Amino acid sequence: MKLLVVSWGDFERWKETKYRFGGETSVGPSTLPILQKVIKPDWTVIVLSDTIGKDFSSVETLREDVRNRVMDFLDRIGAGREVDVIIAPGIGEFTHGSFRGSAMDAYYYVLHALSEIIPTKGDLEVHFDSTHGLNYVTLLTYRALKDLLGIAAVMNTVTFYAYNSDPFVPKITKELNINTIETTMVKPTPLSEPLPGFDEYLCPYSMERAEFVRLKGSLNTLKNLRKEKKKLEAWIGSLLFGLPLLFLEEFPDIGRLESYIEELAETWGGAIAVNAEEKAVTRRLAFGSGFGTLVKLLFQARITRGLLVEEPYSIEKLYSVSDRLFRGSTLQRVRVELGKIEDKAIKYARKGAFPRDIPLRDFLGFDAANREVSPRNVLAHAGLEANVVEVSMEAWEPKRPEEEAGRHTHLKYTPVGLKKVEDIVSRALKES
Amino acid sequence: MKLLVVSWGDFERWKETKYRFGGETSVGPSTLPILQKVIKPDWTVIVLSDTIGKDFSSVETLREDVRNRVMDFLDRIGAGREVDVIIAPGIGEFTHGSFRGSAMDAYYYVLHALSEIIPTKGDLEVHFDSTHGLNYVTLLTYRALKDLLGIAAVMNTVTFYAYNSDPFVPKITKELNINTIETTMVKPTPLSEPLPGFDEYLCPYSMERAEFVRLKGSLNTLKNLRKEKKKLEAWIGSLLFGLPLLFLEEFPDIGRLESYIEELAETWGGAIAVNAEEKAVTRRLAFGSGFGTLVKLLFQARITRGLLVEEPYSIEKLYSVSDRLFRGSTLQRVRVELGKIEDKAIKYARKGAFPRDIPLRDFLGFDAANREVSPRNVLAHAGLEANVVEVSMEAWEPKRPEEEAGRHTHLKYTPVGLKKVEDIVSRALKESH
RNA sequence: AAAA
RNA sequence: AAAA
């Protein structure tokens, strides 16, 4: 699936010019037609600054005013139906109004918007045009794209192209080439940051500190993350460190994460004070890093949702999860660890024993006086530590035990063992 | 070490205004003086475009023109002269003259320039200003900056701050606030690229096929790299996959890497045609991804050179190297592998046994089942695979051998063994890309 | 070329 | 420690 993203400023002030790109030529005031003609994208995203808004009655009359004039202009040069328009929150003192807020709200807002548009299934071919955006909006849009495509690259092949035209110089211009300024095959980069302190999800820009303590107290998100923070960090660690059984058991509730983000989102929007006479928007809450982390976490969950197999969690299923999720030395580590448990299960099967609800240490046949659960042993053995995992073999009549054992041997963490592992993986994620 | 990097356009076109930043305030046409007042950097880097220069009698009269005008502008404003100026190869047809070539030249040029500036020892606090920058130069400077800092963050703590001022609107503007648009603890990202084909180092932009083929065919770099490729990729993989013995045995020659980057950079430089009459700069050669990879490879080697030692490689040495290079489950896996060989050395020592030039499989006491060398076992055992490693125990008189065996036990790849590991690690680096 |  |  091919995707085109473009960073736009004040699209009206652009002049009639012609553009060359990929054995084609075009005439008009923007690059989008000839980009759409050569690239043939399955979908197009237009990131604009809201600061081009003129009518200041409220927030919906700014998001509307801007969307009216955008859709007018896309008709003028024929950009078709397959188009999403992200009106990011810009800032500054302009001719037709004022806009005050955190500069970084544009990143978090566009991160959030992109994370609902970019597909979570199949391979991605992403095309980015920086020709006519603001310096900071184009930079923040770029970083927001790469942050999400990095997570997408875990499960799928992701290629990224960035474009920019020859500079438009008004007095001496004949035609502007669309120069390719980047081509990269995007590296798989799973979420590798903990969830921050419960002060870094929404922050007060121009809100009184006593009023903040009031609204922070009413948000059900921060109270529900008080419980789940450690269970979610355990899942983040599962991908980063190669713990396939922890990946499955700690798999987050996607409906629940949707609702946390929706609440922080509409809480932010509802703190935007619009004065129609002073012509001045004021975003009194700013998005914190924690909002970013939840959006990246939800995106990583959607990307990997296909790998959440039905219980019980057998060796054959853990191999299958691992083969999709991990690469390099991590994948081979996990395969040797599962292979060890499988070979033991084969030996048992040949003797006609099928141990049920046996600690992994007893299954592998360990000495006593090594029951302490260490970081080293949890991370070095793909999270399959001898003192925190319980093994079960569902009894069957073997014919080819070397093939059957993997399907019939099931692993789970003991309730005590899962809390120790959560603590270890969460701590290791914070020391990073 | 605090570093300020600043993306600039036509500084002569900018209007006088006021800037707010970190409690202090500033009158002037540029953000740099207040950025310096508040951040108090140890060194400042200004990144701007060739396309500002006005003298086409030579390519070196064109850079000293831009440099002189930049030096004069720093006098006009409060800014100090403690600065490096990077004049990147820009594109476009302007009134004062024309500039043609690959747009991606700016990326590779700035990457190269920054690799010679960014210190390869100590922690790094990096501050990046994009207010005055032009779109592509700023994206490409940001990109090149992050790519090098990611390699730096393997050995040292690196923090990245990014700034952009409120947008400027004529006469409405009283004071432009300088916003922080990024604050990042830079993740350790070792190089995960193979060296590409000999098509992708220098390419012809505007040059006859035969003249290019002559220039390409004159490069010592491409001939040497043909044979050196696999050892360098084996080294790249050692950082990525957690193979501490391969890191030491395959540590590249910095002199040769320096030599390859100088040659390709001079070939590119010398292929710039400056037409004095009709005011035109044509860069007849373009940099390829291969140039970028080499610049990054040398930077990573400079960053890690402090870990290298002479040929006898002890378990204690592999421990201390691993604890600097590796993190997460990769580090913990390496320590378990070393721990196993250490614990076997302790056992041997208590018996008064000190085996020499013995295969690791015989050292650990293995079956005759599996002699084949597989990617699975090479990558899962931190490259310490039983059929490619030789153990040597330097004889001593033990008293507390649990603490003594580490220094007196040494690991070597066999000549056959090392070639098997080079293939597996090289192939795995190319399959993972 | 601080809204190609 | 069936390369724990």
Q: Nearest chain A residue to B242 by CA: give it.
A: A329
Rg of chain B taking only CA atoms, in angstroms: 26
- Nearest in space to B303 (alpha carbons), one of B202, B186, B406, B384: B186
Beta strand segments in B272-430, E: 272-275, 280-283, 285-287, 358-359, 389-393, 409-413
Phi, psi values for residue A18, rounded to 5°:
-110, 150
**A92 in contact with B at a CB cutoff of 8 Å?**
yes
Instruction: Confirm if B365 and B404 have CB atoms less than 8 A apart.
Output: no
Query: In a 3-state reduction of DSSP, which class is residue A156?
Result: coil
Q: Does A182 touch chain B (CB under 8 A)?
A: yes
- Comparing every residue's Cα with the C1' atom of nucleotide C4, the nearest one is A132
Contacts with B336 from chain A: Cβ below 8 Å: 376-377, 380-381
**Preceding peptide of B415 cis, ω within 30°:** no
Task: State how far residue A395 is from chain B, nearest Cα, in angstroms.
Answer: 30
Strand C reaches within 7 A of the B131 CB: yes
Contacts of B135 in chain A (CB under 8 A): 130-131, 133, 135, 138, 164
Pick among 3.40.50.10640, 3.60.15.10, 2.40.70.10, 2.60.120.10: CATH of A2-185: 3.40.50.10640
Contact A93, B166 (CB under 8 A): yes
Question: Does the beta-carbon distance from A382 to B329 stay under 8 Å?
Answer: yes
Which residues sit opposite A411 in a β-bridge?
A391
Q: Is the CB of A230 less than 7 A from some atom of nucleic acid strand D?
A: no
Q: Are B380 and A326 in contact (CB under 8 A)?
A: no
Say if the Cβ atoms of A164 and B328 lie within 8 Å. Answer: no
Q: What are phi and psi of B268, to 5 degrees?
A: -60, -55
Distance CA B20, CA B224 (A): 54
Looking at chain A from residue 324 to 343, which residues have their Cβ under 8 Å from any Cβ of chain B? 327-333, 335-336
Tally the C-alpha atoms within 13 A of residue B56's C-alpha that lie toward its C-beta.
17
Protein CB footprint (7 Å) on chain D nucleotides: 1-4
Strand C proximal residues, A:173-202, Cβ < 7 Å: 176
Separation CA B146–CA B292 (nearest Å):
13
Rounded to a whole number, what is the largest CA-CA distance in chain B?
88
What are the percentages of helix, strand and coil residues in chain B, rounded to 5?
45, 20, 35
Closest residue by Cα to residue A129 from A17, A1, A19, A292: A19
Domain ranges of chain A: 2-185, 202-307, 315-431
Phi and psi angles of residue B2, each rounded to the nearest 5 degrees, phi first = -105, 125
Cross-chain residue pair A328–B164, CB shorter than 8 Å = no
CB contact set of B253 (below 8 Å; sequence gap of 6+): none
Spell out which residues of chain A touch residue B128, defining contact as CB-CB under 8 Å: none
How far, in Å, is the CA of B167 from the C1' of nucleotide C2?
Answer: 5
Do A140 and B330 make contact, defined as CB atoms within 8 angstroms?
no
Q: What is the 3-state secondary structure (H, E, C) of A5-20?
A: EEEECCCCCCCCEEEE
Please list every residue in chain A whose beta carbon sits closer than 8 Å to the beta carbon of residue B103. 164, 179-181
Q: Which chain A residues have a beta carbon less than 8 Å from that of B104?
A: 180-182
Resolution in A: 2.3
Strand D close to B250 by CB, under 7 A: no
| Residue ranges of E strands in B41-171 | 43-49, 83-88, 92-93, 98-100, 124-129, 158-165
d(CA A7, CA A107): 13
